[model samples]
Target: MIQRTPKIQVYSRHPAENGKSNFLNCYVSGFHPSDIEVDLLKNGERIEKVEHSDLSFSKDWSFYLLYYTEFTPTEKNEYACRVNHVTLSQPKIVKWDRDM
Candidate 1:
C-alpha cells in the first residue's frame, strides 16, 4: 500500500477562554490507507467523549478526518493531540497552545 505522511492540527471552534465551554478539533489529514489513530489529551492524559468525522480525501486521494470533543479550557490544563500512522517511525504529540 502506498503511504503519505499525516499532518495534525489542533484548534478550538472559538477563541479559547478559560472555563468557557468550546469544542476542541484535532484535524488529521494528508494520509493514506485509512489506518490512523488520533487522540485528544488533557494534561498528558487521554480524554473521553471524543468524536470523529468520516474519512474524506482530496483530488490526490490523501485522506483526512477530524477528531473532536467538547471541552472547557482552564488555565493550567495542558491540551494536546497525539497521532499515530504507518508513515511515522514514532507517534507524534502536538501540544495545543492556549496562547496562540
Candidate 2:
C-alpha cells in the first residue's frame, strides 16, 4: 500500500509588506524518500526563476527540500503550490492566504 502524504508548506521570505520583493516558497520535509515535486504559482500563472534544493535526507532518514521563486507582492493574487507524490491519486495543492 502507498502512504506518507506530506504537509505542503508555503510562505514568503519576508513579513507582510506590499513594496518589498520576497521569495515565494513551498517546502517538503519530515517525509520519507524524496519523491516530491512542488511548483509556485501566482494568479494562476507559474512563477519565474523557480528553484529547489538537492534531494537530501537526514541521518534519521527523513527527506527534505526547498522550493522557491522571487516575487514582489503588490496585489492580492491567488498564490498556490501544486504537489506531486507517487502515492497520491489526485493532485495535491496548498493555498497561500493573500494576507499581505
Candidate 3:
C-alpha cells in the first residue's frame, strides 16, 4: 500500500482578558496508515505537556484521519508543532510566533 504525506496546519488564539491564557492548535489531516507522531514545541524546545483529540475519519471513507493538538500558552513565545510519519523523509515542522 502506498502512503501519502500529511497536510499540517498551525494557528494560535489570543484571549480577550488581560491576564487570561492563550491557545495554540495544530491541525493535521489527509495522511495514510493512521499512525502518525505529533509534537508540540515552545521557544524551540519540546513541550511535554500537550492535549490531543481522537482521530476523526474523513467524510469519503478514506483511510486518512484528522488529528489535532492544543496547547495553552501564558506568555509571548515562539511555538511549533512537528509531525512524523512513514510517508515523510523527515519530520514536518509548523511554527507560530506571537507579537509583543
Highest-scoring model, lDDT:
1
| Alpha-carbon local distance difference test for all models | 0.81, 0.68, 0.66
- Each candidate's number of clashing pairs is 0, 0, 0
Clashing pairs in 1: none
Question: What are the RMSDs of all candidates, in order?
Answer: 3.2, 3.7, 4.1
Best TM-score among the predictions, by candidate number: 1
Clashing pairs in 3: none
> For candidate 1, what is the TM-score?
0.82
Tens digits of per-residue lDDT for model 3, 1-100: 6566777766666546733555666667777767788777788777776655457756443344333345566568778878898888998887854432
Q: Where does candidate 3 have its weakest 10-residue lDDT segment?
A: 60-69
> Which segments of candidate 1 are over 4 A away from where they belong?
15-20
Ranking by lDDT: 1, 2, 3
- Candidate 1 lDDT score at position 70: 83
TM-score of every prediction relative to native: 0.82, 0.72, 0.70
